[PDB]
């Protein structure tokens, strides 16, 4: 299985992850079953 | 294939339902049918697997839109989810003590 | 289809109302090597293979694992130890025209 | 001197499949087909199935497009091969098939005892 | 072209394990 969790939020602040605690729900499962070891982004 | 030829000679339609299981979560599933719900009374329960037996009542715990079901601080089950009318139940022992 | 390229078409994740054939009972050939029908719409499997071809009356027999054929040896055979059901409607009124 | 005898019948429910037995020890040399006929409490012998020297078959109008009449390659046993038996099909089956005279092979005739079938 | 920047996670992905309730405890 391939499992997705997520969370989004609202910041004012540049440059810099904030200092914050929030957990993360899950957002999806997906039964895949393929063997992963790279990935790249997209934008 | 004529249209009045004979049966040891007519057109025969057929589809082979061939059944494929690798090494991967299983995808092609038979239906599972439900029984219907009983309250306040010591029943045998069993919600997706997760089995047991007591007495079902209402509550008012509000879980998180995807939990499922609570526990306790012993790690021992104690309210559940309804799969169908998405409510929350309490469950408590089957009453039992000495004479 | 045709005989010659038998169709071939993937089913997976989903469930199989298998009972809304089993309760037919207007068909002409229908045995499944493997599993008993009985349980065949409470199992669950990783793919489902539905290959469609059509035949003869005398053919309808021939596709089998171990019946050889003219079209059995030609378009397709079946393996040694196949999994699977068959099926075949050998109605001459729609699979073939007038003519 | 029993020329036609059938046997392996039974109860099958209605969606179900079965496999009809019978023998004619002698139908190769008559050259004259063999059949199925069935007979029911009040209801005179009417014909199943016909299958004649040749190979091309016939039926009874309620078991055309089901039952499916057939030789065996070897060692000739015409089978009737059907699925999805209805309630109405019980009866007593039987073969027929005419046997030698002093010149013909034929019409002259023999008929099988038959097999009961029930279709529950 | 330049060189790879790095920083600090301070306190951050932790998501709920699985699938059950639980009301005012501490899990482990
Ligand atoms: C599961 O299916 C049942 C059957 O329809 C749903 O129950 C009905 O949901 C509708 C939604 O508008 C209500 O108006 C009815 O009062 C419900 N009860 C009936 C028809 O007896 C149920 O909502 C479904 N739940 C999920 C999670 O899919
Ligand atoms: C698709 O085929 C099914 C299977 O035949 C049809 O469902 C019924 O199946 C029974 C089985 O003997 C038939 O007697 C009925 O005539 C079928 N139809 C109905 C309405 O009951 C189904 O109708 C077919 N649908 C299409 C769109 O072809
Ligand atoms: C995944 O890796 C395992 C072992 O590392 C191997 O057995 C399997 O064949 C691999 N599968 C794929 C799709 O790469």
């Known amino acids: 299985y391939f499992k997705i969790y997520s969370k989004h939020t609202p910041i004012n602040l540049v440059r810099d992850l904030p200092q914050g605690f929030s957990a993360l729900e899950p957002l999806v499962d997906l039964p895949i079953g393929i063997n992963i070891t790279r990935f790249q982004t997209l934008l | 294939f004529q249209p009045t030829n004979g049966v040891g000679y007519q057109p025969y339609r057929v589809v082979v339902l061939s059944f494929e299981l690798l090494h991967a979560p299983a995808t092609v599933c038979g239906p599972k049918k439900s029984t219907n719900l009983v309250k306040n009374k010591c029943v045998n329960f069993n919600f997706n697997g997760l089995t047991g037996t007591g007495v079902l009542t209402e509550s008012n715990k509000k879980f998180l839109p995807f939990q499922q079901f609570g526990r306790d601080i012993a790690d021992t089950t104690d309210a559940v989810r309804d799969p169908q009318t998405l409510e929350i139940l309490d469950i408590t022992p089957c009453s039992f003590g000495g004479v | 289809a045709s005989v010659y390229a038998w169709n071939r078409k993937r089913i997976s994740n989903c469930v199989a109302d298998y009972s809304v054939l089993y309760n037919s009972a207007s068909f002409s050939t229908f045995k499944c090597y493997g599993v008993s029908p009985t349980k065949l719409n409470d199992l669950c499997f990783t793919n489902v293979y539905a290959d469609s071809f059509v035949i003869r009356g005398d053919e309808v027999r021939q596709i089998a694992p171990g019946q050889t054929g003219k079209i059995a040896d030609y378009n397709y055979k079946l393996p040694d130890d196949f999994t699977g059901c068959v099926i075949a409607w050998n109605s001459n009124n729609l699979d073939s025209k007038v003519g | 001197q029993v020329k036609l005898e059938e046997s392996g019948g039974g109860s099958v429910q209605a969606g179900g499949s079965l496999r009809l037995i019978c023998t004619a020890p002698?139908?190769?040399?008559?050259?004259?087909?063999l059949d199925w006929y069935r007979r029911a409490p009040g209801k005179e012998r009417e014909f199943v199935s016909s299958?004649?020297?040749?190979?091309?078959?016939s039926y009874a109008d309620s078991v055309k497009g089901r039952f499916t009449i057939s030789k065996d390659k070897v060692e000739d046993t015409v089978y009737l091969q059907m699925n999805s038996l209805k309630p109405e099909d019980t009866a007593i089956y039987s073969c027929?098939?005419?046997?030698?005279?002093?010149?013909?092979?034929?019409?002259?005739?023999?008929w099988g005892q038959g097999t009961s079938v029930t279709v529950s | 072209q330049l060189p790879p920047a790095y920083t600090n996670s301070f306190t951050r992905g932790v998501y709920y394990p699985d699938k059950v309730f639980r009301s005012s405890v501490l899990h482990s």
């Open positions: 027929k098939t005419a046997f030698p005279y002093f010149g013909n092979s034929c019409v002259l005739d023999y």
């Open positions: 002698g139908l190769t040399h008559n050259n004259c087909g």
């Open positions: 299958i004649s020297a040749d190979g091309t078959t």
